[PDB]
Amino acid sequence: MNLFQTVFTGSKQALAAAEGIVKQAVDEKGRDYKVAFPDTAYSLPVIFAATGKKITNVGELEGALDIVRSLIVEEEMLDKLLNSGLATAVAAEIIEAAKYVLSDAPYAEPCVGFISDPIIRSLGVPLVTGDIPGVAVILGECPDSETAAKIIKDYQSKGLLTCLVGKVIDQAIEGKVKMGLDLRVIPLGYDVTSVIHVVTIAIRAALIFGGIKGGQLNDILKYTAERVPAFVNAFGPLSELVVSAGAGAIALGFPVLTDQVVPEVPTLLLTQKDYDKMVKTSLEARNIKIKITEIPIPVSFAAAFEGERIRKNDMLAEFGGNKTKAWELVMCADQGEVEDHKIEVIGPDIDTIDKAPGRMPLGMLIKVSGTNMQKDFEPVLERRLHYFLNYIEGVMHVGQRNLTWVRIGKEAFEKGFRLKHFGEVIYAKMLDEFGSVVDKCEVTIITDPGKAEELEGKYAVPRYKERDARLESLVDEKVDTFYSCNLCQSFAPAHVCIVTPERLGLCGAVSWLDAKATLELNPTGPCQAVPKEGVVDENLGIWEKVNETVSKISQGAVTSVTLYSILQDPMTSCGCFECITGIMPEANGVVMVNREFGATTPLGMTFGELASMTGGGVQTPGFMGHGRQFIASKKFMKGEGGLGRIVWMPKELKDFVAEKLNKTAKELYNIDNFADMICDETIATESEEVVKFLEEKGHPALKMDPIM
Amino acid sequence: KAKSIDQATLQLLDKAKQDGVETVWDRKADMKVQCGFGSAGVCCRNCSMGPCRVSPVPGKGVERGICGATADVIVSRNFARMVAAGTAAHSDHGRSIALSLYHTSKDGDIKVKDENKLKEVAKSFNVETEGRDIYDIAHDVAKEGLSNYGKQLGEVTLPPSLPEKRKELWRKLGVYPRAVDREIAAVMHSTHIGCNADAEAMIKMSMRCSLTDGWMGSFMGTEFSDIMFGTPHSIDTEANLGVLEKNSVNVVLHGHEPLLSEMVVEAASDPELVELAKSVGADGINLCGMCCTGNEVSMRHGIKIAGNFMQQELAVVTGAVDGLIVDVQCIMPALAKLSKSYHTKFITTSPKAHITDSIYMEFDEENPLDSAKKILKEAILNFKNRDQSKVMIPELKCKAILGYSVEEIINKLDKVVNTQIGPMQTVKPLADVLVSGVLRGAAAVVGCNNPKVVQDSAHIETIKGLIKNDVIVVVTGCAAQAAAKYGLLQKEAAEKYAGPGLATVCKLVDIPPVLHMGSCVDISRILDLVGRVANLLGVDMSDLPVAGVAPEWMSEKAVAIGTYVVTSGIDTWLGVAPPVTGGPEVVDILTNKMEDWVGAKFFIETDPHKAVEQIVNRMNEKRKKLGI
């Protein structure tokens, strides 16, 4: 049986299994029973991508078997083989969809099954910023548990997102691999069809970030081949179904690597028996590049350990919190004041503890020097300090400035981790991440209570005050140069951000100062200067140079952009906005929802459904994606009347932005704790009830001019 | 019917009609209905008791010649003599190359330009290379190659790419080759009156003779040419008659021997000759090549290709050819007569190829560069006799990419090799795409033009059909030049003509769907390639989904080529019927029984679309046999 016949045989078996499980759903639930995946806006993504049709009931699921049949043409030509691979992918999705119909919870821990849309958008940024070099789809079984654990942890230590299908899930558990979405080790399921759950991640990436409409299958296949850096490692004996599923991965442009003897196809299907070189073979086959990090600490330092969890039973000592106040500060000084590679520790070390999880004050004073180092770069360094400290195994860092929290686990301590290794990590990452400006870096870790008390008020508090003052002193009128971030163009070619003092990047990780620091550090980076000349309308937020820049960067996809409006040529979003705001014409205002919120909205749509209406780099009036810091902005919907249009917000988001929103709404002379007027899901969620609440509460939206 | 599918050819045919000169098409028309006996191969003239003609229809008319020879005997002897003549042409070419290799020196006109290739060849000839002078090695290699032509004791030397299974099959069949000239002499002896009167034995002798062409003569000629003049690599060129320049001296190199054309190319950069071209009122020197010598200089230097066999006369019809320099083979003698109607100097250079009423300037191999310089100076001085009012150069030229030697193909295949897997510098990626079925097979398109077929029509149709069916095509000779003129030798052609699997392969490897592997002797390269693939897969060459096609062949060399390709285990399609239809036993041997002997056989198909269909079906049959 040659390659073509193996793939055709596998697709027929996939079709046979899909027909059998659909018959069970019809007999048990009927053709009128609803068919859906948990928390998705694209129905069944593979069928929606291939045909544009949304499948909602069981009767339509049975009619989707004809899609599988039409994709299996048994002629030995490459196009038919790729179509047959897509037939297996469609059949696998139908099988997985029928699982949720038959069982309310078809997947138990540790398997996650289907991956919701908010999770995909959460990992959308890491993908664009390169935080995630690629996606390792590992399925099958390795010869032993340690071999699987070594390969999986090798991918994990390199920052790749690895997905597991089959017995490698159990082998990795025996190998003590830390699994989780935040640990970038996702077990999908023990059945081969569970590999469709990572396929739909790539498919929805084209739908979400690429802005490709459903039914444009070739554009979606082209997108996944160029944009999604996924590859398959198939271990253990491969059945015909596994090979046919691999042809589906090849159809999406994902190369398939295996330890089995197969009819190899160059750059697409490769055999690598040497398990010690499988990771390197896959990175070359998928053109994935990872920068090598060197750190003199006896612990594993990877980005995937940012989500590590340490139980209180096995915690060595904790700093910060309400136990003993701790602080962190990055300050710039003269060349002679800081000498390179001086990690001094003041006070007791971490090994002097002789008890249960101990309380000890902490202080991290970081002194960097350089010719191009100014006071404005300190916030960026201190912000990345949190990520630097959280990448160490056995170390969790929470908070910022003097409201920080550091915990060291016993696992890291038993490996020789001490307090000077904090300085080692900080020094290495400061000279590595910010080598353009940070010529020298002297880091001192303080555990003496008196020294921590006296240096916190002498060096840190005044700088916190000056940073807050500088942040409060920045408005769009004060500045004379905006910045444009095109980092997200790796997945949304038509999307260009314009970060202003009063409007940060919709991802929430790029601010005006962050953009200004990225431009200074990397003049060829995504952030570039955009002068605010050629003003057309200050109320709606229009500048001629901004339009010129957006046309140039987006290659003419977007010609006109307004920065302070939601209904006239709004700035595009891609997929990464923390919150999304949509107009509510019945309430004469706008509703808002964050990504973490997973309930309904007065518009009748969840966050995923709402967000599937304004992404991909397409100008969509009425729906705007933005960060949480843009909610309480004087330029938030300035053209449409400002903050008065906010009529419904989630309670968690309302509590997050209450103080800032009240302070900004005080300009409308609504001195009423304006956050109280806005409805929330704990008060009312349907349009009738929220409108009644607005009428009773005297909301400014009802008294304003019509928004549409 | 139309004379050609090429528009430049048609414009020049109109001009030739206006000028009152006759072409090969006109002479073909004048020949009218050709003799049926000779067309069927049932005419014999091997002794002066004849001429004898027997009926091409068994059971009717005269059955035997005067000596008693049957139609099958007459047909088999005629076929064998065609094979012997083709083998002689190729072997004489290779012999000249081997002698040139023997006369190489560090400070001479002929040097060694590819030392690595020479060392590999020396390994193949059991010549020591470590700690030795490169020219001592070259002379030893040339001695071994020359011994392949005329050794009377011992076994000949064959390339390592030839599978052991094929050698053993040849030995069991009785066709294992001897020295090349010895096999030619044996074939000529057995066709003498009153010798071999058994068709099966006659065909086997012809196969044995053709093997000395494919694996010894052509192979050694190609490899020694690579050693002396450089291994071809990917290179751009232009093709068709539009490459001629009105305002420059136009020197057209026609023939097969590469040493003369190499020396002419070198002489064209001589400062004195460039100054002389300027002084006669020309912008410069424009060298253009035709047929196989054009293929050689184009593969190695990017010299523009003016045209293939049936275009040679039309090159003169433009009125822009100042000098037409010819060595041997496929040089229409009518050129001499045609040259009287224009200013063109028609220069013969080889003692083997005197042509009446041409200007004879013997190419001196003792001083090749000076001899080439004086010949080129005659061509340049003829520019003063140009009549610009008679000049018409059609503005039809086409970009082409060529230079795909086996080494160049392996270098290209190295791109799609994962570094962590390997190995490098093998044909393994090609074997992988063939085994997986992404490529259905590989087909060699070779051969001449023939007035019996609309010129270049069969070549182009066969090539387009094959690449549309995900069959990668390698081309040589006049077929390669037809592909170049048409525009198939382009990377863009992959997305314009190829099927899905071949288009993907071309994109991944960055090659055209059609690979120009050189001249007619460079068909040995094809053998080499196939052999390597077979040796990588541990099978004989008859187990692979490969084929050869000669859509428009005319020459005895083409007959010998097809015979040794079939004998090597590669099915061959002939687009022009050979004169064998009069002998039913010979037809049955060539098209049916041959498969029992060597695992391949001839296919006679004059319809190119049907030929493509048959090739695809046969390749699928062999794939199903092989399990892929």
Ligand code: SF4
């Ligand atoms: S500023 Fe815009 S382009 Fe840059 S990361 Fe944020 S959303 Fe993406």
Ligand code: SF4
């Ligand atoms: S092939 Fe024979 S019979 Fe025919 S014309 Fe020639 S000599 Fe005469």
Ligand code: SF4
């Ligand atoms: S060899 Fe025989 S058949 Fe041929 S010409 Fe002589 S007598 Fe006739």
Ligand code: NI
């Ligand atoms: Ni986005």
